[PDB]
Amino acid sequence: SMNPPPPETSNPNKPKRQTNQLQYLLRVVLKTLWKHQFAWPFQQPVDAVKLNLPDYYKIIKTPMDMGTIKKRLENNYYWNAQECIQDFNTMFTNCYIYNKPGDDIVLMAEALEKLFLQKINELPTEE
Q: Of all residues in this chain, which one has the CB nearest to ligand 6JC in the complex?
A: 41
Q: 44: how many CB neighbours lie within 10 A of its CB?
A: 13
- Cβ closer to ligand 6JC: 54 or 124? 54
Residue 126 C-beta: closest distance to ligand 6JC, Å: 31
- Cβ closer to ligand 6JC: 8 or 55? 55
By the criterion CB under 6 A, which residues form the site for ligand 6JC? Answer: 41-42, 46, 51, 53, 95, 98-99, 105
Residue 12 C-beta: closest distance to ligand 6JC, Å: 29
Residue 48 C-beta: closest distance to ligand 6JC, Å: 8
Residue 78 C-beta: closest distance to ligand 6JC, Å: 22
Reduce the DSSP state of residue 106 to 3 states and report it. helix
Enumerate long-range contacts of 44-51, CB under 8 Å, 24 or more apart: 45/3, 45/6, 45/7, 46/3, 47/3, 48/1, 48/3, 49/1, 49/2, 49/3
DSSP 8-state class, residue 37: T
